[PDB]
């Protein structure tokens, strides 16, 4: 968990073709937009 206290917040989702694209890879792993 990372503290979200300041002005820094800049997370909201909206890309061109991909939207909420979840990766699962044999090595790495993640969640994007």
């Amino acid at each position: 968990k990372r503290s979200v206290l300041c002005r820094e917040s800049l997370r909201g989702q909206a890309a061109g073709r991909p939207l909420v694209a979840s990766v699962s890879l044999n090595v790495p792993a993640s969640v994007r937009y």
Binding site: K1, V4, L5, C6, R7, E8, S9, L10, R11, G12, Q13, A14, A15, G16, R17, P18, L19, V20, A21, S22, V23, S24, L25, N26, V27, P28, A29, V31, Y33
Partner: protein, 419 residues
């Protein structure tokens, strides 16, 4: 040097190729199975499918698969969305062949063994837990199940109650119906098309019509609210966007950007973002907000996303609405649309400035359209949007069935009747 090269076969699977200059080649078979293809009885199956990529298959044992790609330093990514499922495959120029034969087993020869599938199961929880760490994912998910009823309302992560219940005939069935020829599109970033085709022809010829899962779209306004203990609250307000690759859509996108607040500057605040300005003025010191814009084949979702603190939730939430109402009242000057546009255009180009980006863009297009639209053309379309057009679209959010999702302490989060 050589530009891409699409080719629809008798099966209906697309395939492209670009012999690039640089050392790294990347194939990626995009099958048309998204989350939207499961039913009440089949939910959570793509998820597991996504996580089960390294299991034994007909020609290669889980051990060889993994150790094999490692051998050569390759990566195998299995990415999905509500609509599609890209199966990426990176490696060195020389090793495509060893790698390709891997991608083909994984995708056309999966062997879900009771014992293997079973040990995976628990992975689903671990994966769900790590992606549910970003409020964005649970809200954004909650949004889709509120706003839809049936198909796209299905989430990407397996429902808690289903986890261990994902059975091997389920996986086998899902592959069989959805991982088929008509729904597939090969894409190479450093391979020969001539040799690509041959392979495609030899290994990708399987039959399976669409919607054995239950395809169809539908939008339904609804609200999903998740109470927490966290200071911060996130909520999404969204109305039926325009559909994928259509003019209306495109318009939305441009509008999106006139309000759209994805910082282009580190530690920098937007001067351009209307939403941010308007919100900001009526809002407290710490807060953040941005225009949300989703587009799928048979429906879309446009609106915004907010991150406010307990007491400020409404103030921000309405503020943002009011401002988007302004554009819907007609109030929008030419100077801002052109900026927007250029913002968009610049973004789409940077989106495709990377191998990974390009490869996605291309496959993506192959499942929608059936061919590759070049950038330029793309660029033209976005420009055609009228300054009015944008307003008009906007008019549609304010006058389109609402659908919201929030998380955190909801004392101060407007309901549907609140706004």
């Amino acid at each position: 040097p050589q530009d891409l090269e699409f080719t629809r076969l008798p099966n209906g699977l697309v395939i492209a190729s670009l012999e690039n200059y640089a050392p790294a080649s990347r194939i990626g078979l995009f099958i048309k199975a998204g989350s939207r293809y499961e039913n009440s009885n089949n939910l959570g199956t793509s998820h597991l499918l996504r996580l089960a990529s390294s299991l034994t298959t007909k020609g290669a044992s889980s051990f060889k698969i993994t150790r094999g790609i490692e051998a050569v330093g390759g990566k195998l990514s299995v990415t999905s969305t509500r609509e599609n499922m890209a199966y990426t495959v990176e490696c060195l120029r020389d090793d495509v062949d060893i790698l390709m034969e891997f991608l083909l087993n994984v995708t056309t020869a999966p062997e879900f063994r009771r014992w293997e599938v079973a040990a995976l199961q628990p992975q689903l929880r671990i994966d769900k837990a790590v992606a549910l760490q970003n409020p964005q994912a649970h809200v954004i998910e909650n949004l889709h199940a509120a706003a839809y009823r049936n198909a796209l309302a299905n989430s990407l992560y397996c429902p808690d109650y289903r986890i261990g219940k994902v059975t091997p005939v389920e996986l086998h069935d899902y592959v069989q119906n959805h991982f088929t020829s008509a729904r597939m599109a090969l894409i190479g970033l450093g391979v020969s098309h001539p040799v690509l085709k041959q392979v495609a022809e030899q290994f990708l010829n399987i039959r399976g019509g669409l919607g054995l899962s239950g395809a169809k779209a539908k939008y339904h306004g609804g609200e999903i609210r998740e109470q927490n203990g966290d200071s911060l609250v996130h909520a999404a307000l969204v109305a039926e966007s325009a559909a994928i690759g259509s003019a209306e859509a495109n318009a939305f996108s441009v509008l999106q950007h006139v309000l759209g607040a994805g910082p282009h500057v580190k530690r920098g605040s937007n001067a351009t973002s209307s939403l941010y300005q308007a919100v900001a003025k009526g809002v407290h010191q710490p807060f953040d907000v941005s225009a949300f814009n989703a587009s799928y084949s048979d429906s879309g979702l446009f609106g915004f996303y907010t991150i406010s603190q307990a007491a400020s939730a409404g103030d921000v939430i309405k503020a943002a609405y009011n401002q988007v109402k302004t554009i819907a009242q007609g109030n929008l000057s030419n100077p801002d649309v052109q900026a927007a546009k250029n913002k968009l255009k610049a973004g789409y180009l940077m989106s495709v400035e990377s191998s990974e980006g390009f490869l996605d863009e291309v496959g993506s297009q192959a499942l929608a359209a059936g061919s590759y639209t070049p950038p330029s053309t793309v660029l033209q379309q976005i420009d055609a949007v009228a300054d009015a057009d944008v307003i008009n679209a906007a008019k549609k959010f304010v006058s389109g069935r609402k659908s919201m999702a929030a998380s955190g302490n909801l004392g101060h989060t407007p309901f549907i009747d609140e706004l």
